[PDB]
Scaffold this active site. Structure first.
Site, PDB file in Angstrom:
ATOM      1  N   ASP A   1     -23.724  25.850   2.684  1.00  0.00           N
ATOM      2  CA  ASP A   1     -24.483  24.720   2.138  1.00  0.00           C
ATOM      3  C   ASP A   1     -25.979  24.985   2.109  1.00  0.00           C
ATOM      4  O   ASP A   1     -26.696  24.319   1.368  1.00  0.00           O
ATOM      5  CB  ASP A   1     -24.311  23.459   2.993  1.00  0.00           C
ATOM      6  CG  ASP A   1     -22.849  23.037   3.170  1.00  0.00           C
ATOM      7  OD1 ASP A   1     -21.933  23.545   2.482  1.00  0.00           O
ATOM      8  OD2 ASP A   1     -22.622  22.158   4.018  1.00  0.00           O
TER       9      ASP A   1
ATOM     10  N   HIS B   1      -9.952  23.735  14.577  1.00  0.00           N
ATOM     11  CA  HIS B   1     -10.749  24.949  14.747  1.00  0.00           C
ATOM     12  C   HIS B   1     -10.738  25.509  16.166  1.00  0.00           C
ATOM     13  O   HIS B   1     -11.704  26.168  16.607  1.00  0.00           O
ATOM     14  CB  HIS B   1     -12.178  24.716  14.238  1.00  0.00           C
ATOM     15  CG  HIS B   1     -12.869  23.570  14.907  1.00  0.00           C
ATOM     16  ND1 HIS B   1     -12.750  22.269  14.467  1.00  0.00           N
ATOM     17  CD2 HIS B   1     -13.675  23.528  15.994  1.00  0.00           C
ATOM     18  CE1 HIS B   1     -13.454  21.477  15.254  1.00  0.00           C
ATOM     19  NE2 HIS B   1     -14.024  22.215  16.189  1.00  0.00           N
TER      20      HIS B   1
ATOM     21  N   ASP C   1     -10.096  24.019  19.328  1.00  0.00           N
ATOM     22  CA  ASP C   1     -10.574  23.387  20.564  1.00  0.00           C
ATOM     23  C   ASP C   1      -9.964  22.054  20.972  1.00  0.00           C
ATOM     24  O   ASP C   1     -10.339  21.504  22.009  1.00  0.00           O
ATOM     25  CB  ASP C   1     -12.108  23.298  20.581  1.00  0.00           C
ATOM     26  CG  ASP C   1     -12.680  22.363  19.517  1.00  0.00           C
ATOM     27  OD1 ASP C   1     -13.922  22.331  19.450  1.00  0.00           O
ATOM     28  OD2 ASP C   1     -11.937  21.681  18.755  1.00  0.00           O
TER      29      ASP C   1
ATOM     30  N   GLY D   1     -12.732  15.974   7.852  1.00  0.00           N
ATOM     31  CA  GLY D   1     -13.195  16.005   6.460  1.00  0.00           C
ATOM     32  C   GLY D   1     -14.575  15.391   6.323  1.00  0.00           C
ATOM     33  O   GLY D   1     -15.233  15.093   7.322  1.00  0.00           O
TER      34      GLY D   1
ATOM     35  N   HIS E   1     -19.768  17.968  17.014  1.00  0.00           N
ATOM     36  CA  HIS E   1     -19.532  17.665  18.433  1.00  0.00           C
ATOM     37  C   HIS E   1     -19.978  18.847  19.286  1.00  0.00           C
ATOM     38  O   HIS E   1     -20.154  19.951  18.782  1.00  0.00           O
ATOM     39  CB  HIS E   1     -18.068  17.301  18.683  1.00  0.00           C
ATOM     40  CG  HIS E   1     -17.152  18.477  18.711  1.00  0.00           C
ATOM     41  ND1 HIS E   1     -16.776  19.097  19.886  1.00  0.00           N
ATOM     42  CD2 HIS E   1     -16.535  19.150  17.715  1.00  0.00           C
ATOM     43  CE1 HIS E   1     -15.969  20.105  19.605  1.00  0.00           C
ATOM     44  NE2 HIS E   1     -15.815  20.163  18.293  1.00  0.00           N
TER      45      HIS E   1
ATOM     46  N   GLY F   1     -18.287  25.719  27.245  1.00  0.00           N
ATOM     47  CA  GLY F   1     -19.356  24.829  27.696  1.00  0.00           C
ATOM     48  C   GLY F   1     -20.660  25.152  26.983  1.00  0.00           C
ATOM     49  O   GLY F   1     -20.999  26.327  26.810  1.00  0.00           O
TER      50      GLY F   1
ATOM     51  N   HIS G   1     -20.542  22.434  17.652  1.00  0.00           N
ATOM     52  CA  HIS G   1     -19.722  22.664  16.466  1.00  0.00           C
ATOM     53  C   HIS G   1     -20.097  21.690  15.362  1.00  0.00           C
ATOM     54  O   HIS G   1     -20.229  20.494  15.613  1.00  0.00           O
ATOM     55  CB  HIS G   1     -18.230  22.496  16.793  1.00  0.00           C
ATOM     56  CG  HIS G   1     -17.705  23.497  17.776  1.00  0.00           C
ATOM     57  ND1 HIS G   1     -16.433  23.414  18.302  1.00  0.00           N
ATOM     58  CD2 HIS G   1     -18.270  24.603  18.320  1.00  0.00           C
ATOM     59  CE1 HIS G   1     -16.242  24.422  19.138  1.00  0.00           C
ATOM     60  NE2 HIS G   1     -17.339  25.163  19.160  1.00  0.00           N
TER      61      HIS G   1
ATOM     62  N   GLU H   1     -17.925  21.678   8.755  1.00  0.00           N
ATOM     63  CA  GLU H   1     -18.227  22.295   7.458  1.00  0.00           C
ATOM     64  C   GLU H   1     -17.906  21.384   6.273  1.00  0.00           C
ATOM     65  O   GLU H   1     -18.406  21.598   5.154  1.00  0.00           O
ATOM     66  CB  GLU H   1     -17.524  23.647   7.305  1.00  0.00           C
ATOM     67  CG  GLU H   1     -18.027  24.465   6.097  1.00  0.00           C
ATOM     68  CD  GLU H   1     -19.530  24.700   6.153  1.00  0.00           C
ATOM     69  OE1 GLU H   1     -19.948  25.594   6.908  1.00  0.00           O
ATOM     70  OE2 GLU H   1     -20.284  24.009   5.430  1.00  0.00           O
TER      71      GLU H   1
ATOM     72  N   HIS I   1     -29.398  16.120  18.402  1.00  0.00           N
ATOM     73  CA  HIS I   1     -28.383  15.340  19.105  1.00  0.00           C
ATOM     74  C   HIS I   1     -27.339  16.232  19.783  1.00  0.00           C
ATOM     75  O   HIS I   1     -27.087  16.072  20.974  1.00  0.00           O
ATOM     76  CB  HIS I   1     -27.736  14.388  18.108  1.00  0.00           C
ATOM     77  CG  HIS I   1     -26.639  13.532  18.673  1.00  0.00           C
ATOM     78  ND1 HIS I   1     -26.768  12.169  18.835  1.00  0.00           N
ATOM     79  CD2 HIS I   1     -25.361  13.831  19.018  1.00  0.00           C
ATOM     80  CE1 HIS I   1     -25.633  11.669  19.290  1.00  0.00           C
ATOM     81  NE2 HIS I   1     -24.763  12.656  19.414  1.00  0.00           N
ATOM     82  N   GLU I   2     -26.727  17.149  19.027  1.00  0.00           N
ATOM     83  CA  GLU I   2     -25.701  18.062  19.574  1.00  0.00           C
ATOM     84  C   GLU I   2     -26.235  18.890  20.742  1.00  0.00           C
ATOM     85  O   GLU I   2     -25.573  19.018  21.774  1.00  0.00           O
ATOM     86  CB  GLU I   2     -25.100  18.963  18.475  1.00  0.00           C
ATOM     87  CG  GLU I   2     -24.299  18.177  17.421  1.00  0.00           C
ATOM     88  CD  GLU I   2     -23.334  17.199  18.062  1.00  0.00           C
ATOM     89  OE1 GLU I   2     -23.312  16.014  17.672  1.00  0.00           O
ATOM     90  OE2 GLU I   2     -22.635  17.606  19.005  1.00  0.00           O
TER      91      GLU I   2
ATOM     92  N   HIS J   1     -26.285  17.059  23.977  1.00  0.00           N
ATOM     93  CA  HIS J   1     -24.980  17.198  24.653  1.00  0.00           C
ATOM     94  C   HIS J   1     -24.813  18.560  25.339  1.00  0.00           C
ATOM     95  O   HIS J   1     -24.347  18.624  26.490  1.00  0.00           O
ATOM     96  CB  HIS J   1     -23.807  17.027  23.669  1.00  0.00           C
ATOM     97  CG  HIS J   1     -23.653  15.648  23.096  1.00  0.00           C
ATOM     98  ND1 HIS J   1     -23.658  14.506  23.865  1.00  0.00           N
ATOM     99  CD2 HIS J   1     -23.413  15.243  21.823  1.00  0.00           C
ATOM    100  CE1 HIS J   1     -23.440  13.454  23.092  1.00  0.00           C
ATOM    101  NE2 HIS J   1     -23.299  13.876  21.848  1.00  0.00           N
TER     102      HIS J   1
ATOM    103  N   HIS K   1     -24.218   9.725  25.284  1.00  0.00           N
ATOM    104  CA  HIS K   1     -24.731   8.871  24.211  1.00  0.00           C
ATOM    105  C   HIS K   1     -25.591   7.755  24.760  1.00  0.00           C
ATOM    106  O   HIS K   1     -25.385   7.313  25.889  1.00  0.00           O
ATOM    107  CB  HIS K   1     -23.585   8.302  23.390  1.00  0.00           C
ATOM    108  CG  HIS K   1     -22.978   9.307  22.466  1.00  0.00           C
ATOM    109  ND1 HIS K   1     -21.631   9.349  22.166  1.00  0.00           N
ATOM    110  CD2 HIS K   1     -23.547  10.343  21.802  1.00  0.00           C
ATOM    111  CE1 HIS K   1     -21.402  10.358  21.339  1.00  0.00           C
ATOM    112  NE2 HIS K   1     -22.545  10.983  21.115  1.00  0.00           N
TER     113      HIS K   1
END
Ligand SMILES: COc1ccc(S(=O)(=O)N(CC(=O)N=O)C[C@H](O)CO)cc1
Ligand SMILES: [Ca+2]
Ligand SMILES: [Ca+2]
Ligand SMILES: [Ca+2]
Ligand SMILES: [Zn+2]
Ligand SMILES: [Zn+2]
Length: 158
Positions: free
Chosen positions: A19, A63, A65, A71, A78, A87, A91, A94, A113-114, A117, A123
């Protein structure tokens, strides 16, 4: 919960979304790490080979995990809290359309954000916080962590 017990943290980009321009993926992820190094003692370095603390992955659907993507729309990304193995890993679905701007889903903002984590943050209930679990585009050139994000991260580091 878990935190990194060291100051030098490595990351690796496993693969690249079609992308975006490659250089723009590198820069978005780099800038997103910088948001957090700005307010902690952490230092982040991109490695090109071998095992990183934080592996950045683009993938669709199932994928490997047990956290399958859904979609276009819905779950955009996440990540796993600090620890060995997967750890720290972040991810990105796509099935979204990743961009440098207001169109599609902004990679930089999502990655801030990711990575939160990946560093041990959960959150926030505050809509102003980057850690609020609803995507809403904000101008990336002037983006800033909320008070809530800073207090959250500084409760874990520094
Ligand atoms: C600004 O940064 C983000 C905002 C939202 C999301 S998200 O994919 O939409 N999110 C999953 C999530 O929190 N993953 O860490 C929320 C709900 O599960 C689905 O709406 C991801 C990054
Ligand atoms: Ca999705
Ligand atoms: Ca890892
Ligand atoms: Ca895509
Ligand atoms: Zn995953
Ligand atoms: Zn989240």
């Amino acid at each position: 919960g878990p935190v990194w017990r060291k100051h030098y943290i490595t990351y690796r980009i496993n693969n690249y979304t079609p992308d975006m321009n490659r250089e723009d993926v590198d820069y978005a992820i780099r800038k997103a790490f910088q948001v957090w190094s700005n307010v902690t003692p952490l230092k982040f370095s991109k490695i090109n080979t071998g095992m990183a603390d934080i592996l950045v992955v683009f993938a669709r659907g199932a994928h490997g995990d047990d956290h399958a993507f859904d979609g276009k729309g819905g779950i955009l990304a996440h990540a796993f809290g600090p620890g060995s193995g997967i750890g720290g890993d972040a991810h990105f679905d796509e099935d979204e359309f990743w961009t440098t701007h207001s169109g599609g889903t902004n990679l930089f903002l999502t990655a801030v954000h990711e990575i939160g984590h990946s560093l041990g943050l959960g959150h926030s209930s505050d809509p102003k916080a980057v850690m609020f679990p609803t995507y809403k585009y904000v101008d990336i050139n002037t983006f800033r962590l909320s008070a809530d994000d800073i207090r959250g991260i500084q409760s874990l580091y520094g």
